[model samples]
Target: TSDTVFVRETQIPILIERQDNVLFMLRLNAKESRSLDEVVLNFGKDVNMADIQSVKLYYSGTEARQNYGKKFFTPVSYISSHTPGKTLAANPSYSINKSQVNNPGRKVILNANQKLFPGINYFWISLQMKPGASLLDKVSAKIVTVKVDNKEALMHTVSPENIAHRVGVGVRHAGDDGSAAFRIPGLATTNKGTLLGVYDVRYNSSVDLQEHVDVGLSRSVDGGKTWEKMRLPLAFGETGGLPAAQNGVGDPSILVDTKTNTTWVVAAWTHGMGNQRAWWSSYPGMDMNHTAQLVLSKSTDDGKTWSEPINITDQVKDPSWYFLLQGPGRGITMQDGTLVFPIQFIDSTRVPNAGIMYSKDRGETWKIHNYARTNTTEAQVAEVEPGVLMLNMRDNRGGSRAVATTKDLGKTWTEHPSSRKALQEPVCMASLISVKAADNTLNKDILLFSNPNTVKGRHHITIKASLDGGITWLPEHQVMLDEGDGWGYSCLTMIDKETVGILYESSVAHMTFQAIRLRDIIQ
Candidate 1:
């Protein structure tokens, strides 16, 4: 968009080096602020484990995103691309030096930006600290570990949510077409950098609810390196709007402002009718918080053109944790300008919770914040510095993966709620494309997370990484543990600088939709 093209850190900001009895885990205590090449490392058992010793990363610019006041997370760029291949491959920030048992001799302070060092430099790390000060609560995690590339992580598996079957309407609303059919209306795309999005089901189940909520897209151009797919942008009988495979507008949450090149797609509560009478084609699902109304549609050309869809969840609600249902659970735009969205309501009628919405004028108008964590799905954010925000979601009532945040942007959120690291348990409609910069700058900006970790395995999946934003969480994977039903409830797009694109709906028999390119599964 702007003629910048990679090569940052302001101009090699700092690829530091350090020593002297290090230690970290202080995102906000003002703990002496430290000095000289900030790095905190400790690895035990009397250090010296044979050979090899060296790793550093850190960043402090971007203003720290302001410092979590409440909104938890709503910062997305998903790794935005200006084009220029690799100059640190869109660094979102990082800082690490593996060694546990309370981090003995573990000295590392990384800072990304060499364009991710020729691709394959990911983001996501856990340990926001709190319980006994956690580095897993002062290491000893079996002598701590951290070897990334050659693998060697040492002890990690933190769960807070685990599904038992049942997501929203009790898993029996395939045909839950609540009259207004725009089924599965959650999408995002970009070709300049190459990224696509999809999370829709088809409608037209004969009489009762009309199915055809199908629309699958997953692409990428050279920027992301490689990926394929052409079209399937939905909620249409063909444009002018109003046509049903079922009603309301199925699950959706996507945003791209390539500076007004514009593209914003967010949806929720449209249909959930028993997989539309078991029509089964692809992208099939029978559950996911069912509230009604949280809409959007804007495409200033990038999406070819769209402006007829807009609802803003009608006045949205989800207090007792959730069930009355609401739509789209992750939105962003801030630093001061402001534009936030987070709605995963589900009082089902009165108590279920999960609500958050505030607009400085962008999404029209709205304001409400729900916390607790029940009917929420795929909520992502990473703003490592300037206001600190790192989060994750998809908590169908306790199953976990619902990490909370919000330093200042969303107003107030830190009574300590959104917590779940090391990922596990049935996940749905996920996304974490963040980065504010710092914590070992890779010249960074890369945070991608999509769930479905496990629980009777709906195809096993997990993607974690937080250069700095989430404070900690470095390198995580379970990419396509199995790849079934197209890994259904999924969503992601950042197809540039080494590629990254994801779209679901493959085996539910709903009929095909599985876009590729995210490093072609890491080479």
Candidate 2:
């Protein structure tokens, strides 16, 4: 195997809006170096070659790993044509024109004689999707053959499984619509099958609230395929003689009322803290000058328009607590038409606790319940059984998540059997939702969970499924999305009966949207 080239597996389910989608990697051994002449890639029959914008080849230095079993990759200095003010001049060694290729295959011939170095040289294959590419279409690409010095070279493949992936869309990126960064994803699907995604539109930088931030929303009509323009559902800039920096609102949570078809978004509004963050400047009082307020905004239409911020801090927060806010993920509408949002509040002792805030009368008023667990923040809720709600929390203890269940609307909580042991995290926000399985053979609702599935750092964003109401998460029933590290907040929503949609902060973009078929995770 001294002079042979090895094709290795890479991450799949590439984003459709992404300019550089790494298809696979080629490894050259140290015993011999060869001159690359030509390489061929085959996109299976399901893909339209016209939808492919271009194909690129790059030489990532020896720092590229020798083991292809892991998902992590060394950060490369590759630029894409999609980036503003950036060109691909110094990135790829060779580029292929899509128009020169035929239906299902592309052949790349190097114009200049490029030599491959010995000792673990990594060659990357990337494809750019056209802007007009359909989101409903699936793509499967493979490296069929390679030519060195105009002669065929013996090759082997590592993990040669053919996996089909749906194209993902960049829902929001850095500098999109003049926002410096986008973070904290909250996504939900309405009763009319409309998808509404909400997040913090940080105007200055990626820092947390007490800055000039607004809650922005993106709507999709065709089951997470394409999204419309960004809309500000909650923005309170300098309303009460306060500067825009003091009136920032962020950490949004969304919920859709199935009975009335109304959508709701809740956030934390920091006021009169010009130069400090909400967590530190907020004191134990209900006034605007003292504490961060919990606010709500709703839309009667699917997602066309939203109401102004309605302050609920006076109505719900304990005045002696330091701060109170909605969990930075989407809420759930229960089986009995009750709208519930997972919430967190600092107690009089300054200890954070996770709980639920519910509205039985359809968003007119709200009531709070007892805290579920201590030292937990930014949790998500799911109705595992009738009248039983589960609060999956980001434990401040740092290794695993905390779980608890309540039947009387958080009046009394019982620690779950798998609490703090089932799901691992880096103390970051996560997403959880329960949906009826399409097949009904399981005789129960399926639970889907997503987070950065590691205790060490915020990478390896993955989605896991449980058939028996989240009692266990099997290894086979999980899929990892992004391996590179990012802000590590995610939200999950069912796009349709057959598909699930996720919005999260990814390494490639500020916010990325991808659709996964229900069957892919369950199997």
Candidate 3:
């Protein structure tokens, strides 16, 4: 008979600390059921064989069918100590040593004892990275050949291209800190070189407020390789006769002042609504008994300790607006030492608009600007030039992003030429930031924007670079991080002069943090 064994690559992104990182899958026909013996895999030159702790093989059973199509890969059913779930493979059939695996060319011989029976027996090839693997490394692996019943088996390539993926960590997983879900990632790099990642800690379930949700944070001093324990920098249970679950504070937007090295986080505090969402239930008023209140918290010691909640609704929010909140991604500190955060509010007619709130003299007092664009919400601001600011927003109409520019801190707004034409989205929150080269690699500063990079469903999260401010984005200056679907929110920050870090909701975990070399996307 013809060859009865076939192999294909899995469509799962690999994280450095994840143990069951599946690289590829194999299938055996019922007519050719036999004992599997040996398999060989080739790694890219960038992959460090020593960093691989072990290689494992498991029987993952049949493939799961998704709405899009029949998926050939298995879901990640296990997380390390954080959450418990069904194992993708109960017990690995064979395990190989790290020293035995070599870069470019290596063979792993499996004992020919387990029987492969039935119609289409599924098998997986998994790898575990060492504890201290370098996050800067990009690794790729491919199957060279396989043996069935001690004989060579015919192979077919399902994935033709050999692609390298950046190493990252699962910053927060479901049930990591007794929370059912974590969403709305806000990542910012402090002047002290610490990475502050903030998000919504949904306690009961994945639904939005009003429920037990709090603004949670994760701090990384070593450039996102490792993180400190999760902290609730902004959590409110009950106040002003509001019930426990009704008082929720979430959707955090973070910023760092480079002048004084102070970190600031802003969120919306919804109170007195029993089960209705704040977006719908908040009415036009000023106090906590009225509409959603805008709150702020600052960290002066590199995110070590945060001050009490400082209500800024009276200072920045208009009493006529139904609800108000920050971008839930991040803000920017201008070159002239001014602080700017993207703001959104619902007008009297229940229409949402995007704008900015700025502080000229640090975080002492704040001022609001007029609406930049109608039918837009959840925006991110970046100082593309010395005094010019670009506000990239998520349009409710849903095809692409709406971009606007302001030279005088949003007093006079002009629609950017690339608005709704340059960046495509699935109506999801995106990230944008400006960075200058540390060395003489580039003559001008570059702007980095990241989103789903599609008008369809939320998948294929990509980062695109623009050389001439936010005017144009070239195809070559882009890098795709994840191709699987998830919550689809992302935030970006410059980790250093040569590196950029992103914290996003990914398919691998609730939140994944990846560090990318600036040259990979810009140069």
Candidate 4:
């Protein structure tokens, strides 16, 4: 084979082929705000805008939350050179992503990707170069054309005061995730910035996961800044006219209507066994029957006082309403004033899927809407506008967390979709919330969605806007990526304008609860 042989020569040439990589042209996006009417934009003008070729964004830290499973070794990071890099902290809400304020020459360019939007102010872009590439880089400022609104601006240099400084690191302590039973605080809204809900926390000693079945609530009057624990609304047994033990209380996520100053809650369960009558036992405050079928009550005076509860599910015994055949009674009201609720049944044996129900005259009378194998302990309803209703339910009946909708009143419903990217269905007692607003306008809607760009347990929050009614959701992004260990049967409230606050039971003392806030963790 080593011997050479003479070959005939031809004029035709053979073609050669080789593998190649598809280059991606990235673009920069720095949306400062989502308010439609008050759109804004901010970008460096000193750098040659024309020379800019590629772009990408950087994400910083997370707000305070109870999800312990979603922590990252590098919780704070920035995207540079199309590569994700670890950082020591999270960036602030009102700050830019650039590392320096005086280093204008330090920048990276990417190809256009048709990803620009209006009202951009605080965005991130990479400025590092490819190591060992050995190409001509770092051009002069005169070679760039900084454009804004199609107008030219002067070039200036900038640098971050401390390149190694970190943000979003205040909440770095590894939080405690209860190694016990289900604990949902049943958080609700009160007119005085207070939250009213239940807590059915248990410990490892619980039998069949049933322990400490109480119904006390807590209040955070200062927009979650601080809290005052309240004895449960119901005792250990019968509540809202329903059975007790085997009835062990659960899922306390709640809601409140300021117009009527009423708070409503639901726990998917049934009274059974020796503990069924536990609600009748007088302990902290309630000695009356409390854990009855889907009890519906209210606190007309901003939770300072409460009203006698009505056994809305009583009619179900005669098929009048099906006695909470599928829910503990959870749902939302349309903007125009219609109610939504979910129902469930217990076999006196085990937990099962639930159904849905709704009422017109405020819980006075109810009608069956729909039923399913779904089991969302914390069922919530949200109204984007008049005639639109979106039901945020726990992963109880559907085997996963879901969002169902109805175009008409609770007459009929379309299929549902999972809302939270939940892992290991939430053993929760509450549902997602629609922050209070004047109306479902673009500016107001965007202001509260802070979720258009994330899906991590710590950031995964599914809040979609609807141009139409609630029939359709325009999902901007997923929020909260962390798998909150406590099922955090809690609620969220706007502390001021920039901060969102919450109060929920945590594994602070194993089976006990503790209240904390984002401001305390982030600031």
Candidate 5:
């Protein structure tokens, strides 16, 4: 009996702020032209819809019914009455604002003739909070029944997924934003276990460097389950005696000092490089000493605000190098509390090499080290064991990875047994992270590495587990976050003792944080 109805429990909650219009986009895993039979939207059983001035529902293959998957709705639906919210609904798993609404077992059913388009089917729900209303609320659709061939169909669930963060232009830049083109991803875990994501808020163009760019941030306090509004943790404006447009700073890396509960953000400041062809082109450096300056900023009160960037280029970069910058991903805090940032430099001979910048005094100052791999590029580091570090790098020589080990912290390096053959790359940035063995629930020493995992192109965003302290990558433990082509920059951090969080650039959004579980990765 091929019954076309199915039911299961799935929760994808999104946090909504007061007075700010929020969009909850549900990318349904349904086939083309599948009109929803009914949508069971459940609010907090105690919610008062009169407080919600407006609720608009727009459905299309494209967002807001534009560009690609446009039109074919008699009209958008709006609900602004109290009767809907007071109705009995679904189980608690449907709630979005957990703090305000507990497990609601009631729901409101909305009739639907809207057909979902192919690829990504968006149910864009826009809510407006009126005066004298709760600042936060949860609205969810617990059960969605669709029709296929005049018969009901069940919606399927899949991974590498999360909230609806639209790509393209909009607010969140506080009106200082330009055209919305975001790229270059970074992520870090703070001392208090907060998740920080950093990236290029490419206001002008997504093109790399020398454009109107700024370092933007998104922080998650709920273990990567929900994210706060975007903020500029690092921004370059009309400083350096140049217009804000010319003084662009791009490519950010975040590091958290657990010992002092301080957060550090590193970026390459392009103050005077407006005329210097590409960032890789030979030219006079920032401050007339280097092509770019590695700038640093820190936050003390748990990532609420940040200080102005201080140029640390002179401290860690050799005066003779063409340019030096921190690798554009999260850094690490070793067991001994030493801070380490993977670095890359264009030598005097115009060659690229990977290295590190270290600090022993809790980030008050920094020191430089020589190349961990010649002809290598952007890399990430993790202390796989006490005082033992592993450097996972993007190999420029081919499509694989270049790994090196240091017991004395980059004083002397040894190539890993699986350095080049273990992990294949697409000549793009990779992420390496260390999670306490307890988090794995399987072992105490766990190192995770992520990349495109290809030599031909930027596709197959893969995460691999290394149990033997980054010595070898096991195929059985690999997960492909995205099997299709993407920008391929990813960052990894422990979400909790049970889950792993991966923030990556995908075709769906500027970035997506898919929560991977430890049990799913290991036996």
Candidate 6:
């Protein structure tokens, strides 16, 4: 066991430049612990694209465990029509010796149940570059997992490890299996660059707030390539004197305080069943012991362990209010160290509204914002500058989103430039975040949003970019990730200074994560 050579990322980081038919090789090394029954390659690459391009890779061959000299490969191409000012489109009629599903972009590959000897493996990773396009120097690949002795182990790479994983039918007592039916993703990056993801561990069906659910947490030391074991940051157990099945806690929202390095998670907890199954029957009572309470949990050890729930329901909720709960996704920390959570509550008149809950003293105490929006339930918060904050709401207004802004930490509000007309939705929860430009010299900020960009239903999950603060959302800057329908919810976080990460719902899984380059959005 001491001499066992584990599989890992054998290839060194290199650059792929702009030229005709650029070539590169990923040399995978393996030794003593030979037999490779399976291998999952996390090939990461970023490039500025054009039309009539293709990037191809195929297994070259095997070599000695020691030094294996270089080898050659024949690169393939995918061609399509170029409409003057637009990027290349995949069209059969415009095919110039093209390949199938060849958008010629970056991808991930998983090879299961394969046999390999104790030695080195050579892989040919080539890029077909157009002379007119920009150069791509960052060509990186990692062998994420390898199966040996029937046990799978993950590799410890650099930044950007996995934040979430497929935890199927784990310990049955919890109900939710590793067959994770996870939902309502809330992600935050700490001041030390640690990544934390909070979500609903829906052990049962992927239903809303009324079932066997708890707030599950996943932490990553890297940006997001690998994740740690699940931790229930928020739960309602026998202490509440109710079975976890009978006592449901879901819709977690997470925030990290850069000033004090403390992390916070807020969720809506309902003890026992309700008349209309919870969210409908759980109204704001005069005290925490009466209504569906808003509970808080704090983590001071960089998301490893969490403190117990501290109920602040009475502080922000009026006893007469119809409903009040934290936003089901991630919150924000402003430039002045104020912590803000997008929240929704129904005032006495019985209209569902979206507002916020904020703290000025490192989350010691919280206060409520009374300016509520009509028919809006879930919301995401972002700040444009030092004093400008924006609230993008999930509007019941139908066909569009209702957005507003404030200068005094939600004390008052005003409509945004692209309030209802800029985005079309089927009335679903969405994600919005702003990042400073990847190019520092430009000294500009960019806003990125993700949602089911459709009016008919929650399909066509797309990412939109704004070059000027939260203003113009251009069609040319939109990239579609998924076109399938599901419970439309999304959460966004910055992967690093240059990359953005988004965890959203999809047809295959309740929570899926993908990272985007800031240059891909702003340039």
lDDT per residue for candidate 3 within 1-523, as digits (tens), equals: 2245566665545678776676666766545646667777667766777777666666655433332144343434422322433222223333322122322223454333446654445666776677788888777877766777777787766665767756778888877767888889999988778999999998888788778899999999999999999988898877776776788998899999889989999999999887888888898989888889899999999998999999999898888899989988999789899999999999988999999999998899999979999999999999888899999999999899999999999898999999999999999999998886542146468889999989999888898999888889999999898877788899998887778899998877778899988888876
lDDT of 2 by residue, 43-155 (tens): 67767777777676666755444453443233354433234323323344333322222122444432223476655555667667777777655677777667766677777
Could you tally the backbone clashes for each prediction? 165, 2, 0, 93, 11, 19
lDDT of 1: 0.38
What's the candidate order when arranged by decreasing lDDT?
Answer: 3, 2, 5, 6, 1, 4
Per-residue error (Å), model 6, residue 70:
51
Per-candidate Cα lDDT values, in order, are: 0.38, 0.80, 0.80, 0.35, 0.64, 0.63
- Model 3 alpha-carbon drift over 4 Å, by segment: 1-6, 10-12, 28-35, 63-71, 74-107, 110-114, 438-443
In candidate 4 the C-alpha lDDT for residue 207 amounts to 34
Which portions of model 5 show Cα errors greater than 4 Å? 1-179, 275-278, 282-290
Regarding TM-score, does 2 or 3 come out ahead? 3
Error of 2 at 80 (Å): 8.0
| Order of quality (TM-score) | 3, 2, 5, 6, 4, 1
After the best TM-score superposition of candidate 3, give how far the Cα of residue 347 lies from its true spot, in angstroms: 0.5
lDDT of 6 by residue, 1-523 (tens): 1223232121211111211121333333445444434444444443333431544433434553233443211112211111221212222232222112234444433333334344554333334433233212333445555454455643333223321111111111112344236678888888788878888887656566667778988887766655677799987764466666666788989998878889999998877664235656666575434567889999999999999988887678888886688878888888888999999987677778898889998888899866647778889888876678888988887888888988887778998878888878888888887666542323567777888999888777778988776678988787665554656687778867776666776532455555656666656
Taking the tens digit of each residue's C-alpha lDDT, what string does model 4 give over 398-446? 3345556667755666655435443223344344445434422222442
lDDT of 6: 0.63
lDDT of 3 at 237: 76
**Top-TM-score structure, candidate number:** 3
Q: What is the TM-score of each candidate against the true structure?
A: 0.25, 0.89, 0.91, 0.48, 0.69, 0.67
lDDT of candidate 1 over 1-523, digit per residue (tens): 1111111111000101102111111121112222222223333443332221232333222113354342211122222111122111223343333222223234433322221222112122211111122110112112123232233322222221221110000011123232211223233445354344444543443222224553333344333223243244435443224344444244556566444446666654345434443212112222322323345676665555467666554454433322323334235565554555555443433333444555656656767654535555445554434555544666666444666666654455662332654455565545565633331134465466665656444554444554444445444322442233233354455433443443433222221223233333332
lDDT tens readout by residue for model 5, 1-523: 0222223222221112222232343445354445554545455545555655544444533334353243221122212111122111111222222112122234544444555554344453444444343222333333444454465565543322322221111112212234456777888777688888888887755577776788888888876645688888777787767776666787788989878889999988776556443456434444632367789989998888999888887787776677788888888888889999988888877888888889999998998767898888788998877888888888778878889988877778989888888787778888989887765677667888888878877777777987787767778888665554667788888767777777777533456666667665665
**Between candidates 1 and 5, the TM-score winner:** 5
